[PDB]
């Protein structure tokens, strides 16, 4: 039971091997869920599942710089449902974010952000009752 928006610092950034675990329970008739993983300023990575965009679901990755966000990554399969408790992993990996849900691959996202040890920062948002999330290296 955090509170929403979370923030959850990420000392010294990020580096492959890096964990992120986050477990919550959607809420009844969710709009949005986010992650944000933050450099300052930027979002570095920016994990967006849409529950309704013109009547489908759909997850939503970016990057935000300088303000700006880029060109978006778009993911169809969708393994979130309204009042249903979920994990999401993040792995990092050398050359991208690695996300599961629930056990299962979902997605890569390639590093745009190089200085991983900058991303120090995660925003946890939106629809959901968040009930823990850390982080651990494997
Ligand atoms: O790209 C991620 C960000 O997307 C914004 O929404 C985009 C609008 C601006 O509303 O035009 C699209 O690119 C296509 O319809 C939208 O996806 C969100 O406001 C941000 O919060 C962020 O998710
Ligand atoms: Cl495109
Ligand atoms: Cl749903
Ligand atoms: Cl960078």
Same mark, same amino acid.
């Given at each position: =039971? ?6 959850? &610092?990420?000392? #010294? ?6 964990? *992120?675990?986050?477990? #919550?329970?959607?809420?009844? %008739?969710? %709009?949005?869920?986010?992650? /944000?993983?933050?450099? #300052?300023? /930027? ?5 967006? =599942?849409?529950?309704?965009? !013109? ?11 300088? !303000? %700006? ?6 993911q169809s399969v ?5 009042? $249903? &408790?979920? $994990?999401?992993?993040?792995?990092? @990996? =050398?050359?991208?974010? $690695?996300?599961?849900? %629930? /056990? ?5 996202? !390639?590093?745009?952000?190089? $200085?991983?040890? @900058?991303?120090?920062?995660?925003? *946890?948002? #939106? /629809? *959901? ?10």
């Amino acid at each position: =039971p955090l509170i929403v928006p979370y923030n959850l &610092p990420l000392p #010294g950034g990020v580096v492959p091997r890096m964990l *992120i675990t986050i477990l #919550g329970t959607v809420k009844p %008739n969710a %709009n949005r869920i986010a992650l /944000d993983f933050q450099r #300052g300023n /930027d979002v570095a990575f920016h994990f967006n =599942p849409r529950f309704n965009e !013109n009547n489908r679901r759909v997850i939503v990755c970016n990057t935000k710089l300088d !303000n %700006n966000w880029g060109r978006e990554e778009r993911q169809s399969v969708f393994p979130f449902e309204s009042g $249903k &408790p979920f $994990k999401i992993q993040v792995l990092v @990996e =050398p050359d991208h974010f $690695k996300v599961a849900v %629930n /056990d299962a691959h979902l997605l890569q996202y !390639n590093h745009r952000v190089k $200085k991983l040890n @900058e991303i120090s920062k995660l925003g *946890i948002s #939106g /629809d *959901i009752d968040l009930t823990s999330a850390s982080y651990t290296m494997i």
